[PDB]
């Protein structure tokens, strides 16, 4: 959907505004912050048309400044929207909580000696909300970081070039090592 110069209007384009819908419902995830601004901001070609749907547009605008209050407002909004939108009924579950965890990633990445309560304002009243949320999210194996209840920590951690950028080494040079090993075992036995 990076074309934006070849899908103006067609008997395949049920609506170019719906084209924008499908586009944003994959670009607020595909587009990292640089690609975010590249396609949404920089690519003002879709802007001359997405001028017609400013809700998710302003959501994306906050999606740079990281305004988590309106993040959650439009998050509920788009949640209901996907709940009532085609070819998503049995799958739309992740997208929203993914937006949640991804935004929390950068927010914590700001710095460490920080609190969820200071962000509970941006979370709305999000102390218990994010309590169970991030509990089950780190339980979902997400977003290396540190946070408490009696202390309410925030963290910036997880450098790949600490051990993981060196752990992939054996992670693969043992996986494939034994792959070829047994593969080169039955060559004789």
């Amino acid at each position: 959907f990076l074309d934006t110069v070849s899908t103006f209007t067609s008997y395949e384009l049920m609506d170019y505004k719906t084209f924008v819908t499908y586009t944003v419902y994959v670009s607020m995830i595909a587009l990292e912050r640089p690609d975010l601004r590249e396609k949404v901001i920089k690519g003002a070609e879709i802007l001359e048309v997405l001028h017609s749907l400013p809700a998710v547009r302003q959501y994306l605008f906050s999606l740079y400044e990281c305004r988590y209050s309106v993040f959650f407002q439009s998050l509920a909004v788009v949640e209901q929207e996907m709940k009532k939108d085609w070819l998503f009924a049995p799958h739309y579950r992740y997208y929203v909580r993914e937006m949640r965890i991804h935004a929390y990633s950068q927010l914590l990445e700001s710095y460490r000696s920080l609190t969820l309560g200071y962000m509970a304002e941006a979370f709305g009243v999000g102390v218990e909300f994010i309590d169970q949320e991030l509990s089950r999210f780190i339980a979902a194996g997400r977003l290396h970081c540190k946070i408490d209840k009696v202390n309410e920590i925030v963290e910036t951690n997880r450098p790949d070039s600490k051990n993981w950028q060196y752990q992939e080494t054996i992670k693969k040079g043992d996986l494939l090592l034994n792959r070829v090993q047994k593969l080169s075992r039955v060559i004789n036995m």
Binding site: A44, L47, E48, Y64, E65, C66, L107, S110, Y111
Partner: protein, 163 residues
């Protein structure tokens, strides 16, 4: 009629938002396109233009835009206020710009867009002031580092985070 339309195709290019430098080259085509244009139709044809020029943080095309005699070819005091507008555009000093919310208020009166003009100026100035409190050393209290910006936690926090 077309002259207004090209001034549009630049203004649009700043409103449907092609780019600052694009709309500004269009502002030259406006500027050197105001050949034999009525003074109220030409001195205001330079009003919004020198506004957006002081706005662009960089006139950037001096020796053909402000080296052309047109900026010295209008009668009414409108163009003479535009003269100090262009003077600022050259300088654009925080010691002269932000002080002049009123000296640029009659100049804030003809502002084409009030969403970007001085907004981007102070946006840049944020990190421009962030390379004066963080210029001395890496580590610092977030309070006195922002006692210079005079707000220790108001907006410095999320701004620098975004950075």
């Amino acid at each position: 009629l077309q002259a207004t339309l090209d001034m549009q195709s630049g203004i649009i290019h700043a409103a449907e938002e092609k780019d600052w430098k694009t709309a500004y080259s269009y502002f030259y085509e406006a500027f050197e396109g105001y050949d034999s244009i009525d003074s109220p139709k030409a001195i205001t044809s330079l009003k919004y233009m020198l506004l957006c020029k002081i706005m662009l943080n960089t006139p950037e095309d001096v020796q053909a835009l402000v080296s052309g005699k047109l900026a010295l070819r209008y009668a009414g005091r409108q163009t003479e206020a535009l003269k100090c507008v262009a003077q600022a555009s050259k300088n654009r000093s925080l010691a002269d710009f932000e002080k002049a919310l009123t000296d640029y208020r009659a100049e804030l009166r003809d502002d084409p867009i009030i969403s970007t003009h001085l907004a981007k100026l102070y946006d840049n100035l944020l990190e421009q002031n962030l390379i004066r409190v963080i210029e001395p050393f890496s580590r610092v209290q977030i309070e006195h580092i922002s006692s210079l910006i005079k707000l220790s936690k108001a907006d410095v926090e999320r701004k620098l985070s975004q950075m």
